[PDB]
Amino acid sequence: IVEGSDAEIGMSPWQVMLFRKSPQELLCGASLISDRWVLTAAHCLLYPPWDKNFTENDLLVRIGKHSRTRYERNIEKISMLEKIYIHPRYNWRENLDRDIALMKLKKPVAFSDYIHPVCLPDRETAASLLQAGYKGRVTGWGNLKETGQPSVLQVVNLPIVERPVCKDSTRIRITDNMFCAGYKPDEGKRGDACEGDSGGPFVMKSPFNNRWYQMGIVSWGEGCDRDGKYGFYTHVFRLKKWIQKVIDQF
């Protein structure tokens, strides 16, 4: 996260770290949506242009964390993966359309003060809150600058951007399964996700019921925190029917 701040303890209890077993390293962010299911970006697991194709046994998820590098004894919980599910129309060949994946844990994780699931949006919450200017929150342990790494989880609040501005900021083809967020050059304030934050959550706190909803998944950006560029996020609600199909069948 660029131009963010340290999270408070328990501020993002749905935060998940995707961790490579060997070499032991941060791979991506992710989020806890139930005691057995974790949501992330498909490109965190499958990206053939970079020879990336992780299997369940390659990875662990670390839940309840605050420190990036420490083993947080008696606080974090480490879970093995039972199965990975990639969206069948995830477009890794072009523009990361439908950049979404689910991971089922081998055993349920115990909730605690530090471990708790986020809500997924309904149609009405999405329609009400996914408006230009409305702010969401992005969290992660990724790099602090494009060109270094945090001691603890970072948090930044960023406004959703009008779709024509998103489209006009890039040569990439933007789809309805993406939205973009970030400040404009003339707005003064700054902030973005960066490398290592992909797969983590963009959340909004509903003013109707005071619950946190995951509206986006950190998907892609051109650099980090560049003037005139924006971060792009998977539109969780648009893909929720797939999410529910996977959870219902498996």
Partner: peptide, 28 residues
């Protein structure tokens, strides 16, 4: 899922985090 999105150390105890008000103020 019944309790989703309600943080033990914040909403469950009626404590606010340091920047959630920024989000609320943007929901105009």
């Amino acid at each position: 899922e019944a309790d989703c999105g309600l943080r033990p150390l914040f909403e469950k105890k009626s404590l606010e985090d340091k920047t959630e008000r920024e989000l609320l103020e943007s929901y105009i």
